Amino acid sequence: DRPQKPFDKFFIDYIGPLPPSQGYLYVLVVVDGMTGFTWLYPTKAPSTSATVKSLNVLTSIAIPKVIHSDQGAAFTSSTFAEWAKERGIHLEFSTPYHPQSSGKVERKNSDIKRLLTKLLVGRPTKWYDLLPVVQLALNNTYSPVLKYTPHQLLFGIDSNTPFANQDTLDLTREEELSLLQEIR
Amino acid sequence: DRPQKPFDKFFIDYIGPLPPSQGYLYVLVVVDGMTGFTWLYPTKAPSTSATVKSLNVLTSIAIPKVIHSDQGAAFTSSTFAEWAKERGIHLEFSTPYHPQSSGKVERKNSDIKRLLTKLLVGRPTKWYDLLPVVQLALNNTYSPVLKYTPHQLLFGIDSNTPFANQDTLDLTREEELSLLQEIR
Amino acid sequence: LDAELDQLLQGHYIKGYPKQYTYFLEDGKVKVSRPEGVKIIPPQSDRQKIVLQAHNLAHTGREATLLKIANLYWWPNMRKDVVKQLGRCQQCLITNASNKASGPILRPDRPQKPFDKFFIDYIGPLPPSQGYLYVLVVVDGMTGFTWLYPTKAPSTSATVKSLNVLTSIAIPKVIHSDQGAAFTSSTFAEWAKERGIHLEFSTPYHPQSSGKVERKNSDIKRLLTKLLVGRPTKWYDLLPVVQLALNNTYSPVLKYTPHQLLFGIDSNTPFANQDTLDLTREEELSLLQEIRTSLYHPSTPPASSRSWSPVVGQLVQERVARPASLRPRWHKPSTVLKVLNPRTVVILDHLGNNRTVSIDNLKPTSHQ
Amino acid sequence: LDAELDQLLQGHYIKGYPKQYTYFLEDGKVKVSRPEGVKIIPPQSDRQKIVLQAHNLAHTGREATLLKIANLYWWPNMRKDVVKQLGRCQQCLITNASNKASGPILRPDRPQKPFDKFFIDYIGPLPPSQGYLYVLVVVDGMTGFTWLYPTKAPSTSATVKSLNVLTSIAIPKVIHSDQGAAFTSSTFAEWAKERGIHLEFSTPYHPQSSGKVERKNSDIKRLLTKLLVGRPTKWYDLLPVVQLALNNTYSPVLKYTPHQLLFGIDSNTPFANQDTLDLTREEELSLLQEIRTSLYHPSTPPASSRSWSPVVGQLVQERVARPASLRPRWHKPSTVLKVLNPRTVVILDHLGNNRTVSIDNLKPTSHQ
DNA sequence: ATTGTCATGGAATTTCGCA
DNA sequence: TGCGAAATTCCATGACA
DNA sequence: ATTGTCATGGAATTTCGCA
DNA sequence: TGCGAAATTCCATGACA
Numbered sequence A, B: 001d002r003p004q005k006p007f008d009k010f011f012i013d014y015i016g017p018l019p020p021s022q023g024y025l026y027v028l029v030v031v032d033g034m035t036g037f038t039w040l041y042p043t044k045a046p047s048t049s050a051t052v053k054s055l056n057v058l059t060s061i062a063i064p065k066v067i068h069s070d071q072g073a074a075f076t077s078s079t080f081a082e083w084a085k086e087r088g089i090h091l092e093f094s095t096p097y098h099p100q101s102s103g104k105v106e107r108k109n110s111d112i113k114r115l116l117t118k119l120l121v122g123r124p125t126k127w128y129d130l131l132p133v134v135q136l137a138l139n140n141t142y143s144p145v146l147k148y149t150p151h152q153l154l155f156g157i158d159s160n161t162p163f164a165n166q167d168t169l170d171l172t173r174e175e176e177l178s179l180l181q182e183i184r
Numbered sequence C, D: 001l002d003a004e005l006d007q008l009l010q011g012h013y014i015k016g017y018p019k020q021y022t023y024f025l026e027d028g029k030v031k032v033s034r035p036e037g038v039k040i041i042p043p044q045s046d047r048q049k050i051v052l053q054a055h056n057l058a059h060t061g062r063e064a065t066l067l068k069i070a071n072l073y074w075w076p077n078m079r080k081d082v083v084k085q086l087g088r089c090q091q092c093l094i095t096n097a098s099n100k101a102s103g104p105i106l107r108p109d110r111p112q113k114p115f116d117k118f119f120i121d122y123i124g125p126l127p128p129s130q131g132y133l134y135v136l137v138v139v140d141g142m143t144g145f146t147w148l149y150p151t152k153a154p155s156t157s158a159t160v161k162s163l164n165v166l167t168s169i170a171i172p173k174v175i176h177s178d179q180g181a182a183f184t185s186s187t188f189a190e191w192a193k194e195r196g197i198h199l200e201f202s203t204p205y206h207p208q209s210s211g212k213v214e215r216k217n218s219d220i221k222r223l224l225t226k227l228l229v230g231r232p233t234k235w236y237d238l239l240p241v242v243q244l245a246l247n248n249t250y251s252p253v254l255k256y257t258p259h260q261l262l263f264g265i266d267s268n269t270p271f272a273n274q275d276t277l278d279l280t281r282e283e284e285l286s287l288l289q290e291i292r293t294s295l296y297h298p299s300t301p302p303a304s305s306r307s308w309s310p311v312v313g314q315l316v317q318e319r320v321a322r323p324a325s326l327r328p329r330w331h332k333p334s335t336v337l338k339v340l341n342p343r344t345v346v347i348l349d350h351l352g353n354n355r356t357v358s359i360d361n362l363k364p365t366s367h368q
Numbered sequence E, G: 001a002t003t004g005t006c007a008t009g010g011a012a013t014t015t016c017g018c019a
Numbered sequence F, H: 001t002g003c004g005a006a007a008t009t010c011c012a013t014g015a016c017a
């Protein structure tokens, strides 16, 4: 069996709805399986159309052999199947109600939801602008299991933005009683 | 004493008034003394101004050491004297009532008056257009005294328009009784 | 196709497939173990399509196309098939640049006599000066002697007005011009025939062909500029000055001014030369005839290391003259009917018209 | 002046006037009988004026000016006086062309790492496609990997929108650009400082300095053209295709695609290379680091036979950038403050500002 | 059925003045 | 029959849209 | 305070297959 | 240990406004 590689498998998923930010409601999340590298795309809907639009950007940089997803409507449509077939991409589905990624990916997907949550409180409407820094953060985060960040695994070099503070990532007591104030 | 040369002396004079042709009334006549070469310029008046305008064209091709003329008003004005002095041209006047050129020049000036007269009858108003061919004619006319035309003496080559017919130059009987009809 | 590949699998020898390598079957495809790795040997009936797919990714040339194919496949003489396709790609042929230079320039003979040949051309538009925008420049080929006329347009009519005045002095055998609207009109053709003047045209989009006058344009503009430094650009009144100035300027290579070449004696201008003061005019014209024949004449320079020269029957392409944005810089291939000289050819353009054309506006079609 | 010439007439020797010629008086002027003929020897107090008169006829250079003077005069070392005046003619100095070429180009080192240096530039205006007119091209110096963004204007704001998206992937150490309005605005300066990105600018009017990206522009336009042959020029929808196409194209000199240089492994695109299928990613990155350091690098070509290289303190002139019709092509002389490298200098411009400037936009002032 | 040209100023080469 | 310096010639460079 | 680049396709050179 | 032919490398040419 051949060793795992970048572009072997992309794990995709939607997060949202979120508070509107510049007319956007959702985030499509792409994580490379081997490197843990993350790409994020703002969409207005979890539709096949928005997925195709966003993946067209990504897949004009690099094309995965396999895309893995749950059985979301946007991912099981025959349009989305056409699109993938055109690009020679094999589609892969986790059985319904049983999401299976990998340890690395699950942990990454967890970091994403939590890092988002942390930064959306205080400024729940300014997230669109923060997506770039969110990604840099995620991608220059040290992996306990491998000695390396996703940046390093993807490109084979150190980054010009090392995130030296392994950050709090937990909700400070101020944000706990004021996150329960925004949802009131 | 040094031998005579082109540009040593220009002989100038006016002819006219003539019947208006394209708004023009006079012809300034320039004849190089050594070669017998002729230039003609249409003017609206025998003035210093018209002379200067016309000689400016000629003297932008070649500048004579000396201009000879009778004592016409246009040639004895101090403006015309300034103009010549500026260009380092010596002015020369025949004594009043006694025009003296040279054999060659007088004969040339004669040819001009006669050739004009011949072509103006029949079409007394179309002479402006004929000035170019008049000059070519004059300048490719064989000189009995020298073995050469003015073209040949000026440029040192045969011309592409030889005027093989030493022409009639005299008024045919039709033109004699119809030149006395135009002046009626 | 499948015939060849079969004979090969059972260990027999086919011309082109070297015998020292092991050829096998795996995943339903014929493979071979080459030094670089294991490559698929596609059936010949598939190869065109492969080359085409590789080429079409970015419309690459020989090596860049080969390198893609080599990632997956091997077969005999791969580049021959690659080149076959490059030679058939309309899009590459009409978009790519040439990488072969033109042959070395010709230095046509100097016209033997004043008035043998005029070269004419327009300069402009210039900043308006007394309502005038252009200059007609007329340059006698033999002497360099030049005439200048201000115009409002580079029109036939204004050309005709000016030349009627110039040809008062003398009629030329030939007038050479580029393909400007002014010079190619049938009115201008008539005007010339009327006077026994033969019209000669530059090939299109090749101002070098009017080099005699173009080069004079340079000096005319250069002197005008100097004279106008720190003043408004009122050039109309300087034309005469410039004309005279230039006609009386020495060419250091020749050691003569155009005036001298035309008349064999200076007129009354500053620093007039006096060397012939004691000769008769006839003695003077005699020294002029001799000076005229002995003038320096340059030779054709050495060819560059990778030039081409046109051959009858060659496929060549004409440059698109005014190509729109994102459109090919070359026309479709066409054929050389006649090699007029090594730098000038007639081509049949596939329409097909005969066009007389400079090789500077051609490339040899690549891959034959 | 009259002192010297007097001593000379009575047959005494003056340094510079050769003793074997006879010097006399005639028509109130000192003459000499030289092989070419009899010439006037003007008094030294008159010579500047003479040289000036000869020069001013057509603003001629050395020989053409000398030849006029020589028609009438002789004196010692005439050309020295001619050259003195040429060196003082404002009009000649700022209008004439140079006749010395630039020194041979530099081939700066390839950036060591991806993201060490971006080169950015605009292409356009292009025919409108979905309301878009320009393309922002961003080219990573090390890899050649390129990003393409359609814009409506070559503006700072549209630059910033695009780069926010690109720098989601990674932040570069340096971004190199030419002097476009978009890149030199203080808003753009802020945007960069905000991210610890250093801005580097080309010298002005020298697109070669952005050669990495300019050259990529060529391929982008060339592929767009081919893809659009026989269709309307709807380029907007092809940008992504072109990006991918080019990033995955081999450079025959390197034997790698920019993708490979950036990632050390092909993604799922046609004809993907498989040579590292059996290495671990870590083994793969290790072979990548090695491939990255051993890439071919060109050297500075030989100087042409008549080039110049800048010296501190030299009088040099900067080319006028957008010279109006009939106006000088050069600025007044100015001085080299610092030789930054042999092809780049700082000059004090007589105003005087410090300007950093390519030698391609300079000539050495003639005659010192 | 047509085709490069030539001013320019440093450098390279030749000629000049003298012996 | 030779030296130093001035004169002349050579010619790459660049610009005519 | 900065600096040319690189696809291209014939030709030149090197390597390959075989002996 | 050397030949013919194929493969690879060299590199001038030209175009990015």
Ligand SMILES: Cc1nnc(C(=O)NC(C)(C)c2nc(C(=O)NCc3ccc(F)cc3)c(O)c(=O)n2C)o1
Pocket (backbone or CB within 6 Å): C121, C122, C178, C179, C180, C203, C204, C205, C206, C207, C208, C211, C214, C215, F016, F017
């Ligand atoms: C058919 C047909 N339609 N149009 C052309 C055509 O030639 N068009 C252009 C715009 C190129 C042009 N150029 C020059 C010129 O002077 N160019 C500058 C230059 C001079 C010398 C040198 F060596 C290089 C460049 C003209 O004089 C001229 O009349 N034209 C029309 O052919």
Ligand SMILES: Cc1nnc(C(=O)NC(C)(C)c2nc(C(=O)NCc3ccc(F)cc3)c(O)c(=O)n2C)o1
Pocket (backbone or CB within 6 Å): D121, D122, D178, D179, D180, D203, D204, D205, D206, D207, D208, D211, D214, D215, H016, H017
């Ligand atoms: C200050 C200042 N203001 N303006 C400039 C300036 O440079 N202006 C021009 C019009 C010359 C320009 N040109 C290019 C370019 O691509 N030219 C084509 C090319 C490319 C490569 C190569 F080697 C030769 C030519 C640009 O990209 C660009 O932005 N500009 C502004 O500087």
Ligand SMILES: [Mg+2]
Pocket (backbone or CB within 6 Å): A013, A014, A070, A072
């Ligand atoms: Mg989901």
Ligand SMILES: [Mg+2]
Pocket (backbone or CB within 6 Å): B013, B014, B070, B072
């Ligand atoms: Mg009178």
Ligand SMILES: [Mg+2]
Pocket (backbone or CB within 6 Å): C121, C122, C178, C180
């Ligand atoms: Mg023209």
Ligand SMILES: [Mg+2]
Pocket (backbone or CB within 6 Å): C121, C122, C207, C214, C217
């Ligand atoms: Mg022209």
Ligand SMILES: [Mg+2]
Pocket (backbone or CB within 6 Å): D121, D122, D178, D180
């Ligand atoms: Mg730019």
Ligand SMILES: [Mg+2]
Pocket (backbone or CB within 6 Å): D121, D122, D207, D214, D217
């Ligand atoms: Mg550019």
Ligand SMILES: [N+]
Pocket (backbone or CB within 6 Å): C107, C108, C109
């Ligand atoms: N010729």
Ligand SMILES: [N+]
Pocket (backbone or CB within 6 Å): D107, D108, D109
């Ligand atoms: N460097």
Ligand SMILES: [Zn+2]
Pocket (backbone or CB within 6 Å): C055, C059, C060, C089, C091, C092, C093, D226
């Ligand atoms: Zn193609």
Ligand SMILES: [Zn+2]
Pocket (backbone or CB within 6 Å): C226, D055, D059, D060, D089, D091, D092, D093
């Ligand atoms: Zn000057």
